Paper text:
The Maintenance of Lipid Asymmetry (Mla) pathway is a multicomponent system found in all gram-negative bacteria that contributes to virulence, vesicle blebbing and preservation of the outer membrane barrier function. The pathway consists of an OM lipoprotein component (MlaA), found as part of a complex with either OmpC or OmpF7,8; a periplasmic GPL chaperone (MlaC) which shuttles GPL across the periplasm; and an IM ATP binding cassette (ABC) transporter complex (MlaFEDB). MlaFEDB consists of four proteins: MlaE an ABC permease protein; MlaD a membrane anchored MCE (mammalian cell entry) domain containing protein forming a homo-hexameric ring that faces the periplasm; MlaF, an ABC ATPase; and MlaB, a STAS (Sulfate Transporter and Anti-Sigma factor antagonist) domain protein proposed to have a regulatory function. Specifically, we report the structure of E. coli MlaC in complex with the MlaD hexamer, in two different stoichiometries (1:6 and 2:6, respectively), stabilised through the binding of cardiolipin.
Masked refinement and 3D classification, focusing on one MlaD hexamer, revealed two distinct species, one with a single MlaC bound to a MlaD32-183 hexamer, and another with two MlaC molecules bound, with final resolutions of 4.35 Å and 4.38 Å, respectively. In the MlaCD(2:6) structure, two MlaC molecules are bound on opposite sides of the MlaD32-183 hexamer, with overall 2-fold symmetry. Likewise, MlaCD(2:6) has a Cɑ RMSD of between 0.7 and 0.9 Å in the core fold across all pairwise protomer alignments, except for those positioned directly opposite in the hexamer, which have RMSDs as low as 0.3 Å in the core fold and 0.4 Å for the entire Cɑ trace. Further 2D and 3D classification of the data did not reveal any evidence for particles with additional copies of MlaC bound to the MlaD32-183 hexamer, or for any MlaCD(2:6) structures with the two MlaC monomers bound in any orientation other than directly opposite each other. We believe our complex structure adopts a more realistic native-like arrangement than that obtained by MacRae et al. who used a multidentate MlaC ligand which likely promoted a non-physiological binding arrangement with MlaC molecules bound at positions MlaD1 and MlaD3, rather than the MlaD1 and MlaD4 directly opposite orientation we observed. The MlaCD(2:6) structure is also consistent with the observed two-fold symmetry for the MlaFEB components. The interaction interface itself is made up of predominantly electrostatic interactions, with MlaD32-183 forming a largely electronegative surface, composed of residues from β5, β6, β8 and α1 together with the β6-β7 loop, whilst MlaC features a positively charged groove that complements the negatively charged β6-β7 loop of MlaD, composed of residues found within helices α3, α4, α6, the β4-α6 loop and β2-β3 loop. However, binding to MlaD, between the β6-β7 loop and the main body could pull the GPL binding cavity open allowing GPLs to enter.
Numbering used by the authors:
A (entry chain D), D (entry chain A), E (entry chain B): 37 to 152
B (entry chain E), F (entry chain C): 36 to 152
C (entry chain F): 35 to 152
G (entry chain G): 24 to 203
H (entry chain H): 24 to 208
Amino acid sequence: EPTYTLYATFDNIGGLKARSPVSIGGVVVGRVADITLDPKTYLPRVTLEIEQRYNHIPDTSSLSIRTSGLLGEQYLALNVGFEDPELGTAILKDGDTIQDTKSAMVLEDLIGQFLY
Amino acid sequence: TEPTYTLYATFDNIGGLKARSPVSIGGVVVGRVADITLDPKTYLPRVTLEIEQRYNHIPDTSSLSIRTSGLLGEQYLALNVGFEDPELGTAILKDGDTIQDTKSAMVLEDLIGQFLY
Amino acid sequence: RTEPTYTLYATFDNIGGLKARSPVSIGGVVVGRVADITLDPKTYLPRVTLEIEQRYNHIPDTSSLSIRTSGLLGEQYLALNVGFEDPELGTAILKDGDTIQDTKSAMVLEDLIGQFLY
Amino acid sequence: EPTYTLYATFDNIGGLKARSPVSIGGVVVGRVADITLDPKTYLPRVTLEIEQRYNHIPDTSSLSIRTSGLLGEQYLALNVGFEDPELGTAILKDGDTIQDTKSAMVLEDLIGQFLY
Amino acid sequence: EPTYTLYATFDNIGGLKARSPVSIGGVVVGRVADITLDPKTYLPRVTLEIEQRYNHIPDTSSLSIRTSGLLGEQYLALNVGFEDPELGTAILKDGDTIQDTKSAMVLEDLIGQFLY
Amino acid sequence: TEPTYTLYATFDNIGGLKARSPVSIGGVVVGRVADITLDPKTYLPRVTLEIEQRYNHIPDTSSLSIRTSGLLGEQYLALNVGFEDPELGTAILKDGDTIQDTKSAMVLEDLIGQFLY
Amino acid sequence: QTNPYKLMDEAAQKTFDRLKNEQPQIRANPDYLRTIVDQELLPYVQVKYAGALVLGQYYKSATPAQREAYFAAFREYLKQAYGQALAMYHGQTYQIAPEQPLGDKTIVPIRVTIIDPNGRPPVRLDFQWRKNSQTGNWQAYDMIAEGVSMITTKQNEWGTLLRTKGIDGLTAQLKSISQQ
Amino acid sequence: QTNPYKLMDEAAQKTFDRLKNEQPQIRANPDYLRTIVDQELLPYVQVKYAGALVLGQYYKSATPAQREAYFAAFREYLKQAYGQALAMYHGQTYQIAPEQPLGDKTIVPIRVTIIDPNGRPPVRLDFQWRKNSQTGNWQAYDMIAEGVSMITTKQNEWGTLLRTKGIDGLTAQLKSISQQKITLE
């Protein structure tokens, strides 16, 4: 079961534990590895493992966090964008970090926002 | 008895529709999906379903959709029977064809952040 | 339940979440159980056949069925509604082997959002 | 331990079972006896028991059905009115019947009322 | 430890089971002693107790009833009073009784008054 | 584990924040809460907490907060680190100091009266 | 003054009538009911307990002129807010609770009710009458509605604000709220 | 001609055009707006599939006269009751999906988006194009929005009413809803 590794820096992980499945489209194609804190600016950093069998995705993908069904634990959701004919594109090698990001959502913030 | 149709249908997002779940037509169960897999050409899922033989006059331009029951149950597929008329569109679903039109699935969190904002 | 019971037929269009064997209660007290559900290989619509205890036997024909949820997470039970009976005028009585008229349908959390401002 | 009996005819009983508590104010004083149909007009009738230690109460009280907490069982709430000086009052002598109604509430009516 | 008790009337218990903790600003001091009924006006009466270290709460304090979480248990919360020179003062001594109170609430009234 | 170092904080209404809970930052846990008590002088609650030995650099202009977990779970202190800025705000959290700012808890049956009435 | 029910009934009916008859004048200008509110209703209520209850704690430490200005601006705030709340007329009748004598009490609650058939079912307002300990003059201060207060929330919300910014801070805040 | 993408582009262009100067005209009679709706939208919509999809199984038995009457009533109904959210005209730009060629099958979905800052995020409107079997001239019929459909609901609601009251009953209801009211535009 050959795989490979990638790194991502988020903003607030939310209730996401360690060791949880990744999902492209609606299937499972990996599992998150480890999570730690940067000792230079205090932002979280997360390592992820994906299967090498898929290896032609572009370099301008996004990444986000979702919830399951009302009251279900989380899982990293991914997305695939457009690939230009070999212009500003390439192939995720084996140590190139993703760029864009999107945080999670917490409860009290929405309620406080709805009033006041 | 198990005299079965088997058909293929695509999508683009399939929520939490795990395998071996039942499909219903009007409100009764008439079989279950056979298998689920992925594509190595454009990264999109495909679903293979199977049907009994008694019901065997479904008009072609039917429709298929996804929905959930109750509030904390398990999702399932809902069918919708079409119509018949000459010249325009015919074709009885013969073994080995593919249901054409489809609709996408519903996810939460999106609209709850859309409205009430 | 050796007491004999007489049966009736009803036609819906979307039972939603019924099931074999459930109580059809009137007012709020249980009476009879549902017998059999099946589809019609001719126009594709469901149909049900049910039983009724024989002690209660004077229902006017102008009545109705309905489907209903229980609690908020409980299942479903048929709900009857006995209607009006006018003297003199012809209204008859449900002798065995008839099929009552109108009905309603189930309700699943999907059509509601749809009918919500489109 | 000594008790006595009363009769009440409602309109729609709701999910009320049998042998449920009848409470005044906030304490328990009665338990319900039996339920049956009226083979003359098809309306429900229910017999209730009151512990006889209490007596001097008017004959113009009211009775209603109540839900418990959020997703709990149901019970029978009472309401004690006033009492004029023996002018249309009297005491609930063993064998009388209260004269008011107040049925329960079901879900679909509210939704239909709110969405028309 | 040396405790001392007090008496208070009400209007609706509202599901307040006997033996439950009081709270003053978020912390638990003492429990409630017992509940009973009146044989002259048909109203409930509640006796409670308090630990002796705290012993300077001015008289004109307040009590209230509420529920924690979203559907867990429910308790009663105290509200510390306003100290009064010149006017009425009175440190609460054993065998007295707290004064003005407040009553609980049921959801059905709100649900009914919200949809007209 | 490794040594720690402690701090003090005031409040106004701690809801249900009992003893022993994580003092997470950003999303990772870094220590527990020590002791809660009341002040027999003006009747207000006070809390003493501890922080691990490894992280030894926090600007003072920080804040604490309380929030709920999921929709029916536990309660954990949530820290919020401000920013660093030379010349102006220089107070480094050494030992035996008290964070200035703070917030309150949130209990259901007060919202209903706050609005929607 | 003697039996509080007398004062309640008389003041309530006089206020309702004085509202109803001069309502065309209210339609003439909406910035006018405040003077009538302060003319008829206010002389019957009490002030000191309101501020005394909402303040709390910080009273052993107190400044005379500061307390004076606070008690001042408090009544302007109260009259403005209550007059703004008044604007809900459409037409509805009133009824009182059944009388019940007693006597040997100091704190006594009563009830009222208002009803209008074509529109919405009735509601249930309350009050809190208090017997004075100096001359027996009964008096009210609070108000309650279906399980919600109007002093408890003001005691529970304006918290740390006072603890930090200062009493004069709350005074300036109120003075700002004096205009809305 | 062939690529539906070009048709979508020209449609978006001509819709954004000329409709802009209606700000003094919108507050007037909102009646001729039906004509502008008819202008570019109608010549690329297929009423036939709409009808044959909503009418349901009750089609093995039908008469020509009532059929044509229902088709005409449905024409005028969809003419009126489409175009009313246009009152939201305040200005918001449009964007299309990345091109991708194929041209071997018949049914094809595309996409589109609208952008308007200072007030809610963008939305996700879609469409459904179909290659005709009589020649190949593509045309549309359906409309989707964040999961909810816009033709499945009509197939699911107007149920037993047809089963009992009769097709003529639906024709009468549509005659009523044809001049039911005028929008508040």
